[PDB]
Amino acid sequence: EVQLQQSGAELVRPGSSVKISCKGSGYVFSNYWMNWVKQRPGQGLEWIGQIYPGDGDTNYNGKFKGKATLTADKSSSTAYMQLSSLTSEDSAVYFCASGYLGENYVMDFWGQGTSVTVSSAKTTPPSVYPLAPGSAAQTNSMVTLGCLVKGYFPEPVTVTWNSGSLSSGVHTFPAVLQSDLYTLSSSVTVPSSTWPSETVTCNVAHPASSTKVDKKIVPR
Amino acid sequence: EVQLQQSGAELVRPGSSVKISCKGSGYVFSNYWMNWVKQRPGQGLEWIGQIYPGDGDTNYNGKFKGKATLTADKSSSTAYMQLSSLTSEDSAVYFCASGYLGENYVMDFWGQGTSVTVSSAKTTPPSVYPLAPGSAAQTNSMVTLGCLVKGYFPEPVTVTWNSGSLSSGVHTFPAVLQSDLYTLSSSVTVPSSTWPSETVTCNVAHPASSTKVDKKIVPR
Amino acid sequence: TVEELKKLLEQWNLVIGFLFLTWICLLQFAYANRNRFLYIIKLIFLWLLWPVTLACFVLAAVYRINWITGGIAIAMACLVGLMWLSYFIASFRLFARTRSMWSFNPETNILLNVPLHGTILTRPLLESELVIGAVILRGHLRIAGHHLGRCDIKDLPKEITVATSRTLSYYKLGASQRVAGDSGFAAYSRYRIGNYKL
Amino acid sequence: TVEELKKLLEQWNLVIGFLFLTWICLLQFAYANRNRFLYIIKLIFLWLLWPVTLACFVLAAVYRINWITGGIAIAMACLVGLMWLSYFIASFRLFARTRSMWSFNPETNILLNVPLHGTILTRPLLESELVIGAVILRGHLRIAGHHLGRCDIKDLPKEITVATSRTLSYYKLGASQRVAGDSGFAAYSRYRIGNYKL
Amino acid sequence: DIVLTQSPASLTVSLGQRATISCRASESVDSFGNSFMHWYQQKPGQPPKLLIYRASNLESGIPARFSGSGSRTDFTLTINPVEADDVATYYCQQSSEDPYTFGGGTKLEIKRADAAPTVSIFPPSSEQLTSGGASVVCFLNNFYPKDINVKWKIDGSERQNGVLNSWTDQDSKDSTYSMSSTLTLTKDEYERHNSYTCEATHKTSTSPIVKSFNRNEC
Amino acid sequence: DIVLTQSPASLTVSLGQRATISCRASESVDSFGNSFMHWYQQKPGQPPKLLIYRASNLESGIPARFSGSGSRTDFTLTINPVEADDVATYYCQQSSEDPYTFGGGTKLEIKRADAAPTVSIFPPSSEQLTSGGASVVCFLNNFYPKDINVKWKIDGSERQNGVLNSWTDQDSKDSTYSMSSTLTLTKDEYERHNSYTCEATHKTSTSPIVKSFNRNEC
C-alpha cells in the first residue's frame, strides 16, 4: 500500500524561507516522480515542478523557477522543497503526488497537505467558552449545544466532542479572520434525554501554540 | 517467502490407507505444481507424480499408478496424496516440492518430510535411564555424560539437553531396531567446573505415545 | 527484320522496369507489420509466381542450346518444386495445429494462440522460451510484448505455442504477483511439448 | 533474321527464370529473423537495383513508341527516385538518432536502444507505448519480449525509443517488484519525447 | 501555456440526474498518439482525487459512474448517477507540455427539497463575562438553499457591525447547509441594553423564525 | 525410463581440494533446445536442496562454488572449494520425459587428520536395575576415520552377542565421527560376573584404549 506523508504546519515571517518535506513508503522512492501541486486557499491548483530522485533531474514551470527549489535524498527516502523570498502571496497549501507506475504525467495518490502561513503575527493560544441555552434551556423535542473557539492564530484547529464519540449532528463552522485573530464555532445537537444526563465536552487542539483544552459545558 | 508444511508422523497397519497432507503459503497455490518425491530409509529418491490444482490435471510415473492418488483442494490451499494397499515396502519418507515460478520440471523448495511406518507393532512409551561415570567420575580435564532412551516405537524421537541451551559437544546417536523396539543413545560433554555445579537434564519427546520425560542426571 | 525486334525489345524493357518497380515496392513496404494490404499483395504474387516459375523452368528445360542448360533448368525446376511443396506442407501442418491465418506468413515461424475472452488471439513470436512473462500495466495484457486487450490478475491458466515442425508447447499460469495499482506479473511455464494438433 | 532472335529470346527466358528464382527466394526466406545472410543479400539487391531501376526508367523514357509512354516512364522514374531519397533520409535520421545497423531494415520502423552493461543492445519494436513492461524470469531480462542477457532487479534507470520521424521517447525506471525467486516486474514509463538525436 | 477554461463555473443538479462538465483548452491538447488529459475531484480539506486519466480511462478504486468524452479540443466529465457524496470541486489538467496548467474549477451543487432552518440562540457564558467581553451566537442548522441572511436587533435597534457569518460546505449525507452568526461586543456595552434576539429569514417561509431572550432571567 | 548412474558411489576428498561427480544416463537427456538436468544436495534429516538446474545454471541462494558440465550424455557437478559443511549425498535427476528418474546418489566424504577416539564407559544406573535389567554403554567420540571396532569382554571372556553399534554421520564443523556400543543384558546375569570393560582399537595407534570398572566400588 503506497502512501505519502508530509510535515505539519509551517508559520514563517515574510522574507524568510521554508523547507517542506514529503516522504513515501511501500515503493522504491528513487524511481517515482513528484508533482508538488500548489493550491491557494481561495484559488485552485497550480503545478510547480517535478523531481526524479534516481538521477536528480528537476523540471520547473517557469513562474516558480527560483522561488521553489526541489531536492531529494535517496538514503532517507524523503523529498524536499525549499521556498525562498516568501511573501503573503505564497501562503497556500502544497500537495505532493506520484503515480502507481512511477510516471510523471499522472497523479494517482497525493498527500494530506501542508499549510504554510506567511505573516508577522505571533501565535496566540485559543480561548474556549461554553454556549448553552441560558434563557430557558429550550427543552423541546431536540435541543442543541455549542462550543466557541475565539482568539487564536494561526490555522488550523481541530474540534471534536467527547474524544470523537459523538459524530452525529455536529457542525464545525469555518473560522473567519478578525484583527489578525480567528474565531471558530461548532454546534452539536443531542437528545433531550441524554442532556444533562451525561456531561458532554468539546475538545480543542491547537498544535501551533500547544494549547490542549478540554472544556466541558453544563446548564446555567 | 514461499514455504511448504506437511503433517507429522503416520503409523498405519498393513492393508490400510493413509492420506498425507501438503500445504503452501505466500503464493497462489492453484498455479503451482507438486512432485511428491518418495525416499526409502535405505534407498534414494523416487518420483511419484504431479498435480495441478488449477484444473486437477494429474500425471503419474506408472509404478505408483493406482498405489498413489493425488488430490488437491483450492479452498483450503492443501494438496493430498492417498496411499492404498500399504505394505512394508511403502514405509518411506515423502517430500512435496514446487518451483519458484510454478514450473513442474524444477524442484526449488521442499517440505520437512512425512515419515510413514507400516507395521503391526503397537506404540510403546520410551523408558529413559541416566548414564554417569559411576566408577570414579573420571574427573579428568573433560568429563562427559550420557542419556539412554531404550524401548520405544515407532520413530522418531527428539533428544535435547536443558531445553536446547547446551548444543556444544552433543552427539545424538542413531537408533537401531531390536525386537520391534528402538534403542537410542545420546552423549554430551561438559567442563569439569560446570558439573556437578549445575544439574543438567536430557529431554525426550515422543509424539507417537505422548511421553514427555525430563529426566535429570546426578552423580552416584 | 530490324525495327519490330527493337520495338518488342523496348516493350520488354518497359515490362522489366514495371516488374522491377513491383519488386522494389514488395521489398520496401510489403510487410505484415508495415502494410497489411501490401503483405497480402506479396502473398498473392508468391502464390501465383510459384507455378509460373515452375512452368518457366520446364519451358526453359524443353528447349535448350545444348545438354548443359537443360540439366540446370531441371535442377532449378525440381528445387523450386521442392520449396513449393515444403512451404505448403509446413503451412498445412501449422494451420492444422492452430486455427489462424498467420500460418501462411513467411516472416513468422513461431505463433502464439492465447484466447482472451473466447476468441483465440494469434500473435507472432521470435523465440521459443521455457517461461513467457506477462505484464498488465493498468489493465493492458502484454504477453510477450503483444497487446491483447483489457484484463486483470485472473488470467487464463493455459497457453499453447506452435512451431513449424512438431513443438506444440503447453503452458500454465504461475507466479502471480500484484502491486498497488492494476498491474501484474503472472507468467506461463511450459509443461508439455506433446499431443500435437487439437 | 530468324534463328538468332529465337536464341536470344531463349537466353532472356532463362535469365527471367533465374530472376524469378531470386525473387521467390527473397520473398520466402530473406528476413531478419529467419536468415541473416539472406537478409543482407536482399538489402544488397535493393541497394543495387534502386539506381538500376532509375537508369532503366530513364532509358525507357529517352526512347518511346509515342508521347504517352514517355510521360509514364518519367512518372515512374521520379516516383522511384522520391522513394529512394525518402528511404535514405529516413535511414540517415534513424542512424543519427541511434547507433545501430538496424536503421536500414525495411521490416522495422521502431527500434529500442537499451544498454545493459556498457553495450547498447538494439531490438526491434512493433508499437510505441507509454509504458513498457519488463520481466526477469530467473535472471533473463525480457524487455518488450526481447531477451537481452542476465540481470536482476537493479536495472538501468533510462530507456530511449527511436522512430523514423522525430519521436525520441525517453523512459525511466519505475514500479519495481520482487518475488521469492530471481524474477521482477520493473517497467519503464515515458517522460519526454524531445531532445532529438544525441 | 495552455489556458484551460471550465464551463459552467458552478453547476446544480437534482439528485438522480446527470452532471456534465466541459473543459475548454487554448490549443491542441492531444500529443503524438496520446491525449494526456486528466480530471480530478477535490473535497474541502482533502487532497485532489484522480477520476479519469487520458480522458477515456477510469481510475482504479473509482466507481464506474464517471466517464470521459471529447477529443483534442474539448473534454467532458459525465456522472450519470449523482449521489450525496459527489459534492466537490472538479478540475481539469493537461500533461502534454511542460507547464501542467490546471482548470478553473467547477463546484458541483445538489438540488434537494427545501428545509426549514433550525434557529437556536445561545446567550454569552459567565466565562466570557469574567474574561472581559460578551458574545452572543445564533446557530442555523439543517437549511437549504444557501440564500439566507440574519437580522440582529437589540431593544428594537437593528445592528450592522460586529456580526460575523460562516457558511459550512454541503454535507455528504443529507446535503443541507449550516451557518452561524456571532455578534461579538464588549461586556459593559452588552449590559447597556436589555434584549438580544436573532431573526433568521429564508425563502421557505414569508415569516422569519425568531429566537429571543433577556438578561433579567439568566 | 532413463536409468541414471552415478560414479563413484562414494568419494572422499581432502579439505581444500575439488570434488567431481559424474552422472551417466541411459539415453539422450537434452530435449528440443533444453537439457532438463538437475543436481540436488540432501543432508541426513533434511529435504534435498537444489544446486544446479538445467545443468548450467546456479540456483539462487547457493554459493558460487557449484558448477555444471557435460552435454546431452553426461553431467558433472564440480565443487572447486570444499568445506566442512559440504558433506551430504548428491543426486542427479532428469526432467525430459514423464518418468522423473533420480540418480543412484553419491556420498561425499572429507579426508582430515587422524584423531584419537575418546573412550568413556558408563556403568548401568540404579533405575535400570530396579526396572529389571542392566545395560552398559561405551562412548567413542571425536575419532576418524570410520573404520573402528569395539571389543567387549567380562572377566576375560569376550562377548559377541548383545552389543549394538550406532555410527553417527560426519559433523559439519570438525568433520569427526561418533559411535556408541551398548551391551544390553539382564540384571541377574549382569551381577553374575565381576568386571565390565570396553576396549576400542583404531588405526591411529597399535595399542587399543581401554576403560574398565567393577561392581565392588560402585
Residue numbers in the entry:
A (entry chain F), B (entry chain D): 1 to 220
C (entry chain A), D (entry chain B): 9 to 206
E (entry chain E), F (entry chain C): 1 to 218
From the paper:
The coronavirus membrane protein (M) is the most abundant viral structural protein and plays a central role in virus assembly and morphogenesis. M protein forms a mushroom-shaped dimer, composed of two transmembrane domain-swapped three-helix bundles and two intravirion domains. The M protein consists of three structural segments: the N-terminal three transmembrane helices (residues 9–105) mostly embedded in the detergent micelle (i.e., the viral envelope), a juxtamembrane hinge region (residues 106–116), and an inward-facing C-terminal β-sheet sandwich domain (BD) (residues 117–201) composed of an outer sheet (β1, β2, β6, and β7) and an inner sheet (β3, β4, β5, and β8). The dimerization of the M protein is mediated by both transmembrane helices and the BD domain.
We chose two Fab fragments (YN7756_1, Fab-E; YN7717_9, Fab-B) among the six Fab fragments tested, and successfully determined the structures of the M/Fab-E and M/Fab-B complexes at 2.7- and 2.8-Å resolution, respectively. Surprisingly, M protein dimers in the M/Fab-E and M/Fab-B complexes differed in their conformations, with sizes of 86-Å height × 50-Å width (long form) or 72-Å height × 57-Å width (short form), respectively. Considering that antibodies used in the cryo-EM analysis were raised against M protein, it is reasonable to assume that the M protein is in a conformational equilibrium between the two states and that each state was captured by its conformation-specific antibody. Specifically, the binding sites for Fab-E contain residues mapped to the β2-β3 loop, β3–β4, β5, β6, and β7–β8, while the binding sites for Fab-B contain residues mapped to the hinge region, β1, β2, the β2–β3 loop, β6–β8, and the C-terminal loop. Therefore, each Fab specifically recognizes and stabilizes each form of the M protein dimer. Interestingly, we found lipid-like densities possibly stabilizing the long form. Y39 and W31 seal the bottom of the upper cavity in the long and short forms, respectively. The lower tunnel, connected to the extravironic space, is formed by only TM1 in the long form and by TM1 and TM2 in the short form. W31 and I24 seal the top of the lower tunnel in the long and short forms, respectively. Tomographic studies show that the long form is responsible for the rigidity and narrow curvature of the viral envelope and the recruitment of the S protein, while the short form provides more flexibility and lowers the spike density.
